[PDB]
Amino acid sequence: PRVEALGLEIGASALKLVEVSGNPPALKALASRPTPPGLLMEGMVAEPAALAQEIKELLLEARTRKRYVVTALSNLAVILRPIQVPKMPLKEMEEAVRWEAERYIPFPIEVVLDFAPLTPLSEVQEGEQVQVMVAAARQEAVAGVLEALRGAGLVPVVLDVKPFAGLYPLEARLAEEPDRVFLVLDIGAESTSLVLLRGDKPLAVRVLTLSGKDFTEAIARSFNLDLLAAEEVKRTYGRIYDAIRPVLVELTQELRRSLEFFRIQLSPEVGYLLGGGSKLRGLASLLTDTLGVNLEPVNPWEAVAVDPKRFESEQLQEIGPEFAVALGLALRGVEP
């Protein structure tokens, strides 16, 4: 049956939940809890029952009766890459994808796999070549998450991938400019993704290892601080500068590199920033200057009706970079 499902992001820094509902969709509830250490390791859920208890807190905090959910795998658990295949009937395409994907997957095809055509299949004939985006994950990564959700009393309807789910609240705005080339960066705590689009159609995705944790770890090193305290220092201050400079330089290089490899193999007018790592003070200006792309924060909540009597627009805005993904997952939960 046709359920309105919740959006949940099992983030490495924060576990975040969003409830949306109604026919034009409206925000109903949201909640965030810091992720306890040891629960996630390198994209896997190492402590699923402990995650289940954390996710229960979220459902209590949001005060929701909903028990269906869309969530997402960590970017470190999924391989995302495009693959050229001839158009065939759907069951036949699956086998072709699985066959082609086999070469790019550093473990036994034990894998869960999905794909989606980068261009509409109806616009080409049988046998012509189409680019599909393939996603692949270890069955174990998927199993850790489903076991977590089961302990929490939740039923998953979709297991999505963050670089695209983060885009759902921007999609109507990206469709306004169907021919414009846009970049969207999600700087997380565990990874940074980049997605390059034309209008609302992805052209490429790249995931970098470098992220908010790296900035915390450099502050930590530079001042023998604990992670939480280095983290708090990162938030309030943003000399800090001297400790985080090599991270800034390295992130800037890695992002110039990715863009140069996009331009070689396939280039951004404007861009958007999401993810809490994008709020480091001044980062947006730095990245604008250094990548030659006007990069802006953006408010994901505009995708949804927000009741001024229940939420402060000012507060929503502040947490919009961290919540873009959970909001996209909640939008998916109420599709179509």
Binding site: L73, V112, A116, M133, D160, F164, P202
Partner: peptide, 8 residues
């Protein structure tokens, strides 16, 4: 826009 699902 791309909508994947890696649910088994």
């Amino acid at each position: 826009m791309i909508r994947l699902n890696l649910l088994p």
